[PDB]
Swiss-Prot record, chain A:
F-type ATPases have 2 components, F(1) - the catalytic core - and F(0) - the membrane proton channel. F(1) has five subunits: alpha(3), beta(3), gamma(1), delta(1), epsilon(1). F(0) has four main subunits: a(1), b(1), b'(1) and c(10-14). The alpha and beta chains form an alternating ring which encloses part of the gamma chain. F(1) is attached to F(0) by a central stalk formed by the gamma and epsilon chains, while a peripheral stalk is formed by the delta, b and b' chains. This is ATP synthase subunit c. It holds the Pfam family ATP-synt_C. HAMAP family: ATP_synth_c_bact (MF_01396). GO terms for cellular component: plasma membrane; proton-transporting ATP synthase complex; proton-transporting two-sector ATPase complex, proton-transporting domain. One of its GO terms (molecular function) is lipid binding. It comes from Chloroflexus aurantiacus (strain ATCC 29366 / DSM 635 / J-10-fl). It is a multi-pass membrane protein. Keywords: ATP synthesis, Cell membrane, CF(0), Hydrogen ion transport, Ion transport, Lipid-binding, Membrane, Transmembrane, Transmembrane helix, Transport.
Curated annotation (Swiss-Prot), chain B:
It comes from the Bacteria. Transmembrane segments: none annotated. F-type ATPases have 2 components, CF(1) - the catalytic core - and CF(0) - the membrane proton channel. CF(1) has five subunits: alpha(3), beta(3), gamma(1), delta(1), epsilon(1). CF(0) has three main subunits: a, b and c. It is found in: Cell membrane. This is ATP synthase gamma chain. The lineage of its organism: Bacteria, Bacillati, Chloroflexota, Chloroflexia, Chloroflexales. Produces ATP from ADP in the presence of a proton gradient across the membrane. The gamma chain is believed to be important in regulating ATPase activity and the flow of protons through the CF(0) complex.
Length: 73, 48
């Protein structure tokens, strides 16, 4: 009909929010618990945490990019 | 002693380093456990 592109973009952004959001939540909770258990290795695990985030958010970013393409052309 | 050595090597820089393991600064009170024989005739041991 008419709002198919809007529904598509909305669904894509919503799914890229539900997946990566829980993913980065798990990442941050695990990293915080590991840091609390061992502050001496913190730097290393922090970097790994960031790397995980730098992956997970990237997926969400991809979804947003895809949605923007559907929004534009 | 071996188990305690392993455990102490495991834990570093904890919250006040445990309770009995705490290196508490500003020492103001020291308790002493001296052990002595119950009876005499030991010689110089009790005196020492």
């Amino acid at each position: 009909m008419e709002g198919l592109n809007l529904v598509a973009t909305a669904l894509a952004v919503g799914l890229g929010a539900i997946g990566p959001g829980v993913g980065i939540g798990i990442i941050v909770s695990g990293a915080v618990q590991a840091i609390g258990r061992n502050p001496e290795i913190e730097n290393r695990v922090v970097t790994y945490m960031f790397i995980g985030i730098a992956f997970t958010e990237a997926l969400a970013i991809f979804g947003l990019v895809i949605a923007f393409l559907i929004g534009f052309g | 002693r071996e188990v305690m050595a392993n455990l102490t090597a495991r834990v570093v820089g904890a919250a006040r380093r445990g309770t009995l393991l705490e290196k508490r600064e500003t020492v103001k009170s020291v308790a002493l456990l001296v052990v002595t024989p119950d009876r005499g005739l030991c010689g110089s041991l009790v005196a020492n």
